[PDB]
Design a protein around this nucleic acid. Sequence first.
RNA 1: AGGGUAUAGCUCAGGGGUAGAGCAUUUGACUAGAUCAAGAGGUCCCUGGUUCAAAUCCAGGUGCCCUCUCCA
Length: 460
Amino acid sequence: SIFPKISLRPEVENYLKEGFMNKEIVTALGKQEAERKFETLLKHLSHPPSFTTVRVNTHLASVQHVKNLLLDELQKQFNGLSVPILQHPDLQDVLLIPVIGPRKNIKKQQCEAIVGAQCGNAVLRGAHVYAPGIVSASQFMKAGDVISVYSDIKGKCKKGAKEFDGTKVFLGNGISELSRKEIFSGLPELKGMGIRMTEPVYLSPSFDSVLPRYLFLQNLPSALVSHVLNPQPGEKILDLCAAPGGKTTHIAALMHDQGEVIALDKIFNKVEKIKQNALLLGLNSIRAFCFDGTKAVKLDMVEPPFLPESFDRILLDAPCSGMGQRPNMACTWSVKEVASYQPLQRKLFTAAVQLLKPEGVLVYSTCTITLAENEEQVAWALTKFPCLQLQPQEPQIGGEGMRGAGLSCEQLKQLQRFDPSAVPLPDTDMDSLREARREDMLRLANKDSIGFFIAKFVKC
RNA sequence: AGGGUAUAGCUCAGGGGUAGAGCAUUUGACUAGAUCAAGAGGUCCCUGGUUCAAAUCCAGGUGCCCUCUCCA
Ligand SMILES: C[S@@+](CC[C@H](N)C(=O)[O-])C[C@H]1O[C@@H](n2cnc3c(N)ncnc32)[C@H](O)[C@@H]1O
């Protein structure tokens, strides 16, 4: 609709092209079709998901209560507008709020401000512009000025600049709460509000300090993963890559905080964020450690590392290229950087399989779209580890696996791949809201999401 | 079969031989700054290798980073 395709390096886009135009897909669909599919994907990746999805912390508040409180909250934020809050029938603890956009009639002001690409993406998802996000602003900006926020999608704006000839993307208008002086004079690492978005291109609720013990902003497939893993109360679960602990706290909440959830991460501050989240949401069965997942198997003779076959369930939410991220308007990565994940994923996978009890469940999940990080890893896993066996999932929401890794149709039907190019981009407005069938909205929330991949394994 | 990165206070270009920009800061004019000028600035992370010569190329070491909604 409003935004162009995701700005990729020629080599990278050709890499992904090689991915989606393999012999098998061409065979079962034809070049003319697969190419259009790929281009449609690239066109969709630049646009926000049509649904703000919120996970309810059932261990502190029920979905009903939280939904009502959020109804009051949306009443306040949108000055009395009328956007619905659906409840997913399959994901019992997930709420869905439709996105009102895009709005092409926003009049651009002269006082401008430029944020980082990531901050821009956050703004498109319904966030305000907080102080650490601004990397450029009009030198004549005073606190209170109605300014126009632009996203430096290329990340080429040198901080503090008074002008920018690079690539900007209009995100909308907002009331500033700081002058350019207050921001860039001296070096105060100041926090707080910077630009209160009043007329965003996409209208989504701001989830900063609202019900922090009851909510958790989480993409639909991410919330789905913990359900697919299906943790039982009293079991021993471990996710190698956990920070900041969305799926971790979700797993803990599904177990009614009765059991043991060990969460690892390589970076310290991230682990601290895990612990902070767990403490915030009221989960006590969560124990977080700063540790290398690839070296998590006990070898010497003396917390991690852990003995092999000592965990009931294991979640590998492996680090990835993150190509399935939405909205992602540009990606200035090298191809070597994009394909730099398969080995690490395989190491973490091996460490996971070794750490898994017999008849245990291993859920491997990424947020990327590449074959080499998804289906290929499933094939590799099924070959190297013959004790593992691919399992069907519940709930089944996303599409089936992509052809190309040499898996059978029966095998692909047991994978869950979310495709951004599944359904057309819905340009929702209030008139579209009023005349909308509920099943259409639910299908929309299930299909128009970020790129994601879920695979389920069982040991013998 | 993991990868990227380290350069001025901040944000970053560059590049085998005299250290570069924007912003911040400093000073001087014009009416505190939507003006004009002027200069203050860095063992280019550590170590070793290649080389006449490494801030640049290579290897090892270390720190930071590779999202999976919102203080960026
Ligand atoms: C996709 S993110 C985690 C999202 C998280 N699972 C949730 O659902 O919020 C991958 C994480 O992997 C961690 N990580 C990166 N390398 C790792 C490694 N070798 N071992 C363990 N964790 C790693 C990163 O610090 C990052 O927090």
